[PDB]
């Protein structure tokens, strides 16, 4: 039997992706799409839809009952940069909704979860080579705060209540579908607007700032084959360290100059510049690769040319 | 000026000792003890006492005011064994009484803030000796999750808004004026109370468990030191690992077989057992001693020597 998945923060740059390949390999009314926001998007009206806010036990319970619910992808969640600006409701939002889906696995009213963490649970004391998956955490924004703890959490409920809870450090993600929430890698994202609109970009972060990257094709991919593995696969139940690129600016900009020769970058960092800094340059996800099969099939030179036949 | 000090959870293990040494060093008046508990203790009629619920932020507002309160020392929480037994009340007390206080320290209503970590914030994949300031921490109990994501608010608190916040990774405490809170370390209390009044003790702990302990005096000690530094001695904004003494239960029950030659124990491991082996066996507290010269002055000999003493 097919499982029938709710994914809970649907609209959003990874929600919107993971919706669309969900439905096409388990059926299109098998998967549900909710968020909190209902706009005449692509992902809202190519299948079922439902509005909610995560926030509130009650409306998920109540999504769960109506649709079935054995799956829940829990998406929804400020990101980095954005949560920096608001730490209250990030820390609320980003743990609550966590503890609702954990609870109603404990409570046997679901079967599986999917929760993704973040390299932002990394900080200053980590090594910035090749992160290990058992290194330092110290995470300095609110955002890696609540990653971290969540990560605890969900161990907890694994150990504790035998809950099948899954999840995958994401590094900066890039797509073409959808704008990004707020992330403190998304100029990665805004570099290719800029570059096919204006021909010219000015980043938010300086020239040499190294950072784990991957296209979303690739955190799609993983985030639906870690939850499909059968569950003695899944070795780590906090999350696992994940990994397909890493660059600079200045790197991707060179890339994207092959394609648009007359293309321009500054350099002018920001807030979000402190953030990257306190981030791991690479990423090592060996037990990922060895626990359940986990390859990225695109790099550098490859996710520049789709980026740029999907944007122009 | 002297300080006007609020301690919240005065009336625990470590509260009682606490606001006697401050109320001997500033003044009796100077100091104000608070508990959720209004017991015929020694600590509510030795001084001003008031009654106080440290989940409820208003309450705590409304004494910092009548009492001009310049400095907190946050001693409520639930223990790491207590805590298992209620994982959803210790989040909740652990956490939002943490941030009350640092959110009066933000308005800056106080000035200055003491609030307690624990050896707890270690998990399995810990290194066990000689634990660094600085390593892998996944710890596996909803006390230790509480305690690891409470210093991650602290040094942002720190960070971002400028708190003077101080903590210390306290190690199993032992001392002989008020019973434990319900710890992972409680059984080196126990111990003395069941040789003394029975000759005889079943612990709840196997014999060869080393785990990182220290007396009450030298905590206390600790405690007071860190919080008189000159604020630039202050470099871990997060918690400061502490130590003195690391034993097992044979090497206790031994030292105090000397005292009372009858003695006799006998081991009976319970649920405590598995916290105790997701910790450390001793701590590296290298950055404690020379940024605030930490130096404790009890070891196993001269504790259970002074235990006996005061117990019998
Ligand atoms: N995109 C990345 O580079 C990246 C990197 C690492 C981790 N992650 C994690 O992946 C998850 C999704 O990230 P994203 O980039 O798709 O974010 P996004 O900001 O693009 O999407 C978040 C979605 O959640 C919805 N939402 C917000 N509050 C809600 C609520 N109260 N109830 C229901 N829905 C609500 C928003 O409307 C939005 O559609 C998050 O947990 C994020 O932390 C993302
Ligand atoms: N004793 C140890 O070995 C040890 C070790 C590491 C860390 N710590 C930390 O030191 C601190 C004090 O520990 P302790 O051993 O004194 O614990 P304890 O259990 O003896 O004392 C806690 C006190 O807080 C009070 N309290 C509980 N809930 C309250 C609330 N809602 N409002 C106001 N008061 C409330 C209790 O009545 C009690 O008097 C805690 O943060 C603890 O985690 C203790």
Not at 225 to 231: G, H
Not at 277 to 294: G, H, K, L, M, T
Not at 306 to 312: A, C, K, P, Q
Request: aromatic share 10%; charged share 25%; glycine share 4%.
């Amino acid at each position: 039997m097919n499982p029938k998945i709710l994914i809970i923060g649907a609209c959003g740059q990874i929600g919107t992706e993971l919706t669309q390949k969900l439905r096409k390999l388990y059926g299109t009314e098998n998967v549900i799409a909710s968020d909190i926001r209902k706009l005449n998007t692509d992902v809202v009206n190519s299948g079922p839809f439902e509005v909610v806010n995560a926030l509130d036990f009650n409306q998920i319970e109540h999504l769960v009952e109506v649709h079935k619910i054995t799956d829940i992808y829990l998406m929804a969640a400020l990101l980095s940069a954005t949560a920096e600006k608001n730490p209250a409701f990030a820390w609320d939002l980003n743990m609550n909704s966590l503890f609702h889906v954990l609870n109603l696995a404990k409570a046997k009213k679901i079967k599986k979860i999917f929760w993704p963490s973040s390299i932002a649970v990394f900080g200053p004391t980590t090594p910035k080579e090749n992160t290990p998956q058992y290194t330092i955490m110290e995470p300095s924004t609110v955002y890696g705060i609540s990653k971290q703890a969540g990560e605890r959490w969900c161990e907890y409920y694994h150990n504790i209540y035998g809950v099948d809870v899954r999840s995958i450090r994401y590094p900066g993600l890039i797509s073409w579908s959808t704008p990004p929430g707020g992330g403190t890698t998304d100029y990665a994202v805004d570099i290719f607007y800029k570059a096919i609109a204006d021909k010219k970009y000015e980043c938010f972060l300086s020239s040499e700032t190294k950072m784990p990257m991957m296209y979303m094709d690739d955190a799609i991919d993983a985030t639906i084959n870690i939850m499909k593995a059968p569950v003695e696969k899944i070795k780590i139940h906090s999350s696992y360290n994940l990994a397909a690129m890493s660059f600079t600016p200045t790197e991707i900009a060179n890339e994207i100059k092959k394609h648009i020769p007359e293309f321009t970058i500054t350099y002018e960092p920001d807030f979000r510049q402190k953030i990257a800094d306190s981030w791991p340059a690479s990423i090592d996800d060996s037990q990922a690769r060895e626990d359940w099969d986990w390859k990225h099939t695109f790099d550098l030179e490859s996710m520049t040319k789709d980026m740029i036949e999907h944007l122009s």
